[PDB]
Design a protein around this ligand. Structure first.
Ligand SMILES: COc1ccc(OC)c(-c2cc(C(=O)Nc3cc(-c4[nH]c(SC)nc4-c4ccc(F)cc4)ccn3)n(C)c2)c1
Length: 286
């Protein structure tokens, strides 16, 4: 029911291709997993997507299961990632674009959390713009590293644990993630904070650290991140970004974040600039 096209990259635990849904006469994206793999995960991830279905900015998928030597998941085709568009904009976003993105991304993460999961890999590569009439909508992708943090019925939080391996990207990981603490809601939001300052700066001060082993690289990133005060990181930019990061760093393991407070930070800032309020991102202005 699908024709496989060219390879376009890799997800957390599989390979990504373009394809043709011949029944629908539509192009789709296809994720493949070797059926004879040590730790199968595509089916689990598909179940997570299905629990998220219908939410704003949640892609629609179809778990087709096993064809030949591969488990197959099919997703509606989406547009470029925020990293692609960041490079298209020469690696700098205007304050307007950063704040519009911030408002969408805080709420996207809140939705995931409302469905009892934490994402644990918040980074620009995992946010894709929609196509056509939804070209202004930011979608989130990739639940291969997501984890349930509370019981669906009782809302009982999972237990506090330590000595956990880093799951996700080192550049945007929270400080407590580097220290091996079990991730929770606070960590997704802290990662988002680093993503936003990354959009503001073009790079983070813990980028481009040289090391031999990967472990050494991650340790150097961790140390630089813990030795860079938030006020230094955010120097020369509106205080709201530092307030955001400090607020995230003050949350306890099982605290429910005040998402509306953070959105309101950035919205008040947004409303003091004298922008035109047409909803246009930087990449659609050049
Ligand atoms: C027509 O609009 C544009 C404009 C520019 C573009 O590239 C700069 C593109 C464009 C967009 C893609 C693309 O890959 N779209 C896409 C990717 C995924 C995707 N990306 C990743 S990580 C690199 N995993 C998945 C994926 C996840 C689950 C699944 F079942 C299938 C794919 C999902 C849906 N659409 N490609 C190859 C080109 C489209």
């Amino acid at each position: 029911r699908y024709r496989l096209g060219r390879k376009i990259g890799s997800g957390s635990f599989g390979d990504i291709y373009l394809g043709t849904d011949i029944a629908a006469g539509e192009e789709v994206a296809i994720k493949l997993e070797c059926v004879k793999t040590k730790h199968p995960q595509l089916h689990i991830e598909s179940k997570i997507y299905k629990m998220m279905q219908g939410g704003v900015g949640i892609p629609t998928i179809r778990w087709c299961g096993a064809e030949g030597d591969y488990n197959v998941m099919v997703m509606e085709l989406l547009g470029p990632s925020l990293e692609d568009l960041f490079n298209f904009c020469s690696r700098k976003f205007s304050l307007k674009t950063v704040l519009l993105l911030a408002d969408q991304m805080i709420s996207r993460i809140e939705y995931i959390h409302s469905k009892n999961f934490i994402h644990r890999d918040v980074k620009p590569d995992n946010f894709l713009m929609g196509l056509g009439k939804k070209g202004n909508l930011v979608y989130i992708i990739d639940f291969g590293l997501a984890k349930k943090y509370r019981d669906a019925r009782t809302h009982q939080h999972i237990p506090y644990r330590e000595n956990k391996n880093l799951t996700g990207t080192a550049r945007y990981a929270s400080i407590n993630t580097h220290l091996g603490i079990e991730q929770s809601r606070r960590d997704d939001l802290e990662s988002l904070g680093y993503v936003l300052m990354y959009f503001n700066l073009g790079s983070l001060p813990w980028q481009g650290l040289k090391a031999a082993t990967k472990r050494q690289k991650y340790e150097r990133i961790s140390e630089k991140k813990m030795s860079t005060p938030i006020e230094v990181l955010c120097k020369g930019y509106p205080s709201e970004f530092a307030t955001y990061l400090n607020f995230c760093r003050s949350l306890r393991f099982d605290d429910k974040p005040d998402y509306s407070y953070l959105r309101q930070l950035f919205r008040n800032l947004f409303h003091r600039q004298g922008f035109s309020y047409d909803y246009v991102f930087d990449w659609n202005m050049l």
